[PDB]
Amino acid sequence: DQAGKSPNAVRYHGGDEIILQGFHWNVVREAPNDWYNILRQQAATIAADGFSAIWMPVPWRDFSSWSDGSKSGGGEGYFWHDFNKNGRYGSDAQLRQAASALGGAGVKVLYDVVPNHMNRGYPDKEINLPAGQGFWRNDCADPGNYPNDCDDGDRFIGGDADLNTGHPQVYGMFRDEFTNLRSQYGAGGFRFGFVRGYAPERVNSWMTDSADNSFCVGELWKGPSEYPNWDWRNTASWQQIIKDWSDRAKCPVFDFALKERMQNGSIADWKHGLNGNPDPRWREVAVTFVDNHDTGYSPGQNGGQHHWALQDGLIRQAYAYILTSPGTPVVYWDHMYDWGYGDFIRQLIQVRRAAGVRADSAISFHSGYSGLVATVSGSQQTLVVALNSDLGNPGQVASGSFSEAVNASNGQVRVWRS
Ligand SMILES: OC[C@H]1O[C@H](O[C@H]2[C@H](O)[C@@H](O)[C@@H](O[C@H]3[C@H](O)[C@@H](O)[C@@H](O[C@H]4[C@H](O)[C@@H](O)[C@@H](O)O[C@@H]4CO)O[C@@H]3CO)O[C@@H]2CO)[C@H](O)[C@@H](O)[C@@H]1O
Ligand SMILES: [Ca+2]
Ligand SMILES: [Ca+2]
Secondary structure (H helix, E strand, O other): OOOOOOOOOOOHHHHOEEEOOOOOHHHHOOOOOOOOHHHHHHHHHHHHHHEEEEEEEEOOOOOEEEEOEEEEEOOOOOOOOOOOEEEEOOOOOHHHHHHHHHHHHHEEEEEOOOEOOOOOOOOOOOOOOOOOOEHHHHHHHOOOOOOOOEEOOOOOOOOEEEEEOOHHHHHHHHHHHHHHHHOOOEEEEEOOHHHHHHOOOHHEEEEHOOOOOOOEOOOOOOOHHHHHHHHOHOOOOOHHHHHHHHHHHHOOEEEEHHHHHHHHHHHHHHOOOHHHHHHHHOOOOOOEOOOOOOOOOOHHHOOOOOOOOOHHHHHHHHHHHHHHHHEEEEEHHHHHOOOOOOHHHHHHHHHHHHHHHOOOOOOEEEEEOOOOEEEEEEEOEEEEEEEEEOOOOOOHHHOOOOOOEEEEEEOEEEEOOO
């Protein structure tokens, strides 16, 4: 494991990580209070599969509950009331045992953190911030969903649970808990959620104070059409918007530009994600993914959230693309361990490592064929990747001598290495 910051000081931890999203939406309902025991038990496997890091669920306890007729949810971590670690995924002691086993197997533990809001109304919680002290967004006039005096980012729904993350006491609180996660729970980095809710610069401060040389990734899911008409972003590309956030927070960013193309464009169009950017400074900060607990399905209740899921017909193509390309890839728990894409992903992880593909490796796209044809310059080998393509052999598009590395999905997924 390579451990530094990028040339622009972005915290991509060497640019060589391969992350597993360590949970699905329905885990708290499917294996109540047992998740950490399960992960503890799977540690050796996760490490054997080739993952360098695991994205853990929010460790802060969440006893929330909601019902929207058919749909219902709560307890997943995103509506926490406390920093207490005895929540729906397991106890404090089990968490420590899981983190210790993962770390012991050499898998860095990244914690999902939600600074934007908290379960304000929760009757019994250890964190009680009164009103009238500027601790809350609604302590100030709130015209709509844009920054106000008590909150420099968007709000979550009504904004009534939004914290003034910039308040010295709120900043501090989070800052000490991050430090806590690092010293007592083996945290190797963080996943910042709902980054549109507070300033980018604040994530950099938190990273600076608590875990400067660690890995971080921020979730910025906000289209151009969501910015005011006068904002440069209202007319920017998805790439530009996420790139900008990355620049300010000094953290890699989830590639929603790639996700958007996978959903709305054809496969040839996948070259328009951040990870396909010709400028190394742009592609090395992209954290690529096929689906997460928000966009994808999950085993169990309601099929999970499935807000923007990739149809089954592009799953193998999608994993072949992120696993062989620039940016830092993330594998969703379910595709790996529930749905049987495990052996296929294991092979692609081995191909990526053997070719020495990393965050900044170059990528060149070929246009004389159907599908997506790309040449990836790994530090150890060159790969030719052909997805849903009429390409016949690697020599038609690359110089050198190639061997087959992967041939799946009836020739729809083909990978060759020099
Ligand atoms: O008091 C604040 C608000 O409280 C009530 O809001 C409810 C929402 O209506 C529910 O839909 C739900 O929200 C979920 C959300 O649906 C779910 O997707 C998840 O979101 C995370 C996301 O997974 C994650 O990746 C991340 O980065 O950010 C998202 C936001 O944290 O979790 C949410 C929280 O459980 O629950 C809330 C709270 O129960 C109320 O209806 C509102 O009117 C009120 O403003
Ligand atoms: Ca690394
Ligand atoms: Ca906010």
